[PDB]
Design a protein around this ligand. Structure first.
Ligand SMILES: *[C@@H]1O[C@H](CO)[C@@H](O[C@@H]2O[C@H](CO)[C@@H](O[C@@H]3O[C@H](CO)[C@@H](O)[C@H](O)[C@@H]3O)[C@H](O)[C@H]2NC(C)=O)[C@H](O)[C@H]1NC(C)=O
Ligand SMILES: *[C@@H]1O[C@H](CO)[C@@H](O[C@@H]2O[C@H](CO)[C@@H](O)[C@H](O)[C@H]2NC(C)=O)[C@H](O)[C@H]1NC(C)=O
Ligand SMILES: *[C@@H]1O[C@H](CO)[C@@H](O[C@@H]2O[C@H](CO)[C@@H](O)[C@H](O)[C@H]2NC(C)=O)[C@H](O)[C@H]1NC(C)=O
Ligand SMILES: *[C@@H]1O[C@H](CO)[C@@H](O)[C@H](O)[C@H]1NC(C)=O
Ligand SMILES: *[C@H]1O[C@H](CO)[C@H](O)[C@H](O)[C@H]1NC(C)=O
Ligand SMILES: [Ca+2]
Ligand SMILES: [Ca+2]
Ligand SMILES: [Ca+2]
Ligand SMILES: [Ca+2]
Lengths: 6, 5, 208, 178, 117
């Protein structure tokens, strides 16, 4: 999972 | 899932 | 019957069947090939020269004196001294407030908590119900923690993307932010009377 | 003298004594663990899920690091190559094939023997000879030569042939005979 | 006094948020999409509290013990608009005012800023 919450 | 190699 | 060892006044070197008497113990050089004929502490003191040098309690076994420390103390690097352990240095040994004492410890906690029968654990003084709330994408899931059992239900009905959560104890309202709607909402813990807090100016509320 | 096993479904590695008494979890959450090996202070296992080789301290699993990057094609199986000879001991099977016909393995007490893969075999003569199970047996007073010819145990290893193939006078039984 | 609760462990994949309780710590993973529980002092006695279809981002434990009471120095403040608590010893509160407002020399009253932007 990527960091950016979007 | 499977347990084979 | 007919034992397979040497009873009476004999002691055996481990790793062998060699039996030696009460005077042959630590008689000199490490005669037993395994080295167990002698020990590093063997007859260091007689346990008679002023308590044998041990600060608390000496006792002599097959290989000389051994120093005993009362429950709570620890043998120092020098084997003849017993010292107090700092039980408060171990993290979590005392839950909230720990006071180091001579061979002992003291514990206390904040007025919101009460110490248990064991003098370490503190438990919440009020009963209530420890309530855990988690923000899933399209649902705010709330867990009713009790008796090692979790009950799951949805707090509110019309959320789209909730990323942050908090609650106010004074009013008993849960505050959350919606990423897709760009708003911050506040609702009671029973899901009623939802209000908007911020309806504009929010872009990505990481935490609240 | 400890036994280590890795479970790929419960996703943890455990250890216990050789008798299986003291079960402990050396490292929980070890992912999809394939074969595992122990060397030195650490245990090394291959993971089918993240395609990496991990290691951890053999007593508490503290120093857990990944030995390799994400391998391209899902590694499986692992072992250690050691140059020093390991725990050498004298097997009983070298001396006259352990007193058995063809195949023996060193058991807890003396040589232990077994029959080949192919054939309706069955064990005889204190389970030290392999013969074909023709649905026939002999009583407690006949020694059984190979292929089933069985004669009274007094002629057994009397330094004279008594069977059709000399099975009785083979050195396997006469190496230690009374 | 920096300590490690859970470290060098594979229980964590991409953890996002955490909250505390009495001797327990709860946190959410965006990688495994599950909410976890562990001992807050050494990370033992772990268990999965919840599985979620979507990524769980936020988490809070609701209880009065999490929200200890205290005296409110801001309650006696005469500040217009915002009265913010502060760590300065004499007063422990400081008046502030929103975006586009001016802090007057009274340090308690603010006036709207009519300057251009
Ligand atoms: C969900 O929980 C909230 C918790 O606050 C409930 O709000 C509370 O509701 C009660 C009963 O309606 C309120 O008590 C009433 O107060 C008025 C004066 O404001 C009084 O005239 C009535 O006799 C009664 O005592 C209480 O004030 C209110 N709490 C707050 C902080 O506003 C709400 O009712 C719950 N909803 C459901 C559906 O159970
Ligand atoms: C969590 O569960 C407990 C126990 O089921 C709930 O406590 C009950 O609440 C009702 C009112 O809704 C009371 O009439 C009962 O007397 C309570 N029973 C107990 C055992 O206390 C509690 O309401 C739940 N908490 C939340 C916020 O859902
Ligand atoms: C999980 O909880 C158990 C207790 O239910 C812990 O086990 C005890 O832990 C204390 C403190 O370290 C030890 O003094 C006891 O000897 C333990 N007893 C047992 C039965 O093991 C355990 O430590 C916790 N999990 C981990 C890995 O810490
Ligand atoms: C004890 O003394 C030895 C030698 O000075 C030292 O190396 C060791 O770290 C000490 N251990 C403790 C825990 O006191
Ligand atoms: C030899 O004969 C003696 C007779 O008492 C025992 O049966 C012994 O077991 C025999 N051993 C072998 C190897 O033939
Ligand atoms: Ca000696
Ligand atoms: Ca102490
Ligand atoms: Ca013969
Ligand atoms: Ca990560």
């Amino acid at each position: 999972x990527x960091l950016x919450x979007x | 899932x499977x347990n084979x190699x | 019957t007919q034992p397979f060892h040497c009873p009476s006044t004999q002691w055996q070197c481990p790793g062998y069947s060699t039996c030696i008497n009460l005077s042959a113990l630590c008689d000199g050089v490490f005669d037993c090939p395994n080295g167990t004929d002698e020990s590093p502490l063997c007859n260091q003191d007689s346990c008679s020269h002023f308590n044998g040098g041990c600060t608390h309690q000496c006792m002599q076994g097959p290989f000389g004196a051994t120093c005993l420390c009362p429950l709570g103390y620890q043998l120092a690097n020098d084997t003849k001294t017993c010292e107090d352990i700092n039980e408060c240095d171990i993290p979590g040994f005392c839950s909230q407030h720990c006071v180091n004492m001579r061979g002992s410890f003291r514990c206390a906690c904040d007025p919101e908590y009460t110490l248990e029968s064991d003098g370490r654990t503190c438990k919440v003084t009020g009963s209530e119900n420890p309530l855990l709330v988690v923000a899933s994408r399209d649902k705010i899931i709330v867990d009713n923690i009790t008796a090692h059992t979790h009950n799951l239900y949805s707090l509110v009905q019309d959320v789209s993307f909730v990323v942050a959560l908090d609650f106010d104890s004074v009013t008993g309202r849960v505050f959350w932010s919606d990423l897709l709607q760009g708003k911050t909402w506040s609702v009671f813990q029973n899901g009623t009377d939802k209000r908007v807090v911020h309806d504009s100016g929010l872009s990505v509320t990481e935490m609240i | 003298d400890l036994l280590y096993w890795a479970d790929a479904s419960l996703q943890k590695i455990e250890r216990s004594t050789l008798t299986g008494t003291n079960r402990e979890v050396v490292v929980s959450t070890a992912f999809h663990s394939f074969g595992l090996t122990v060397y030195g202070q650490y245990i090394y296992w291959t993971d089918l899920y993240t395609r990496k080789i991990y290691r951890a301290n053999k007593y508490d699993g503290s120093d857990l690091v990944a030995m390799t990057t994400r391998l391209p094609t899902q590694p499986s199986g692992i072992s250690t190559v050691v140059k020093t000879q390991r725990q050498q001991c004298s097997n009983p099977c070298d001396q006259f094939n352990g007193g058995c016909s063809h195949i023996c393995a060193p058991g807890p007490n003396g040589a232990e023997c077994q029959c080949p893969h192919e054939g309706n075999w069955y064990l005889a003569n204190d389970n030290k000879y392999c013969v074909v199970d023709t649905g026939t047996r002999c009583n407690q007073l006949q020694f059984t030569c190979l292929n089933g010819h069985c004669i009274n145990q007094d002629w057994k290893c009397d330094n004279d042939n008594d069977c059709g193939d000399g099975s009785d006078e083979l050195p396997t039984v006469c190496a230690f005979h009374t | 006094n920096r300590r490690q609760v859970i470290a060098s462990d594979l229980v964590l994949h991409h953890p996002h948020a955490l909250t505390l309780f009495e001797d327990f710590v709860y946190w959410t993973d965006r990688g495994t999409r599950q909410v976890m529980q562990a001992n807050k002092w050494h990370g033992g006695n772990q268990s999965v509290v919840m599985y979620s279809v979507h990524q769980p981002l936020g988490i809070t434990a609701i209880h009065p013990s999490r929200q200890p009471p205290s005296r409110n120095p801001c309650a006696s403040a005469s500040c217009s608009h915002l009265c913010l608590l502060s760590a300065q010893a004499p007063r422990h509160y400081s008046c502030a005012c929103p975006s586009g407002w001016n802090l007057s020399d009274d340090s308690v009253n603010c006036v709207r800023g009519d300057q251009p932007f």
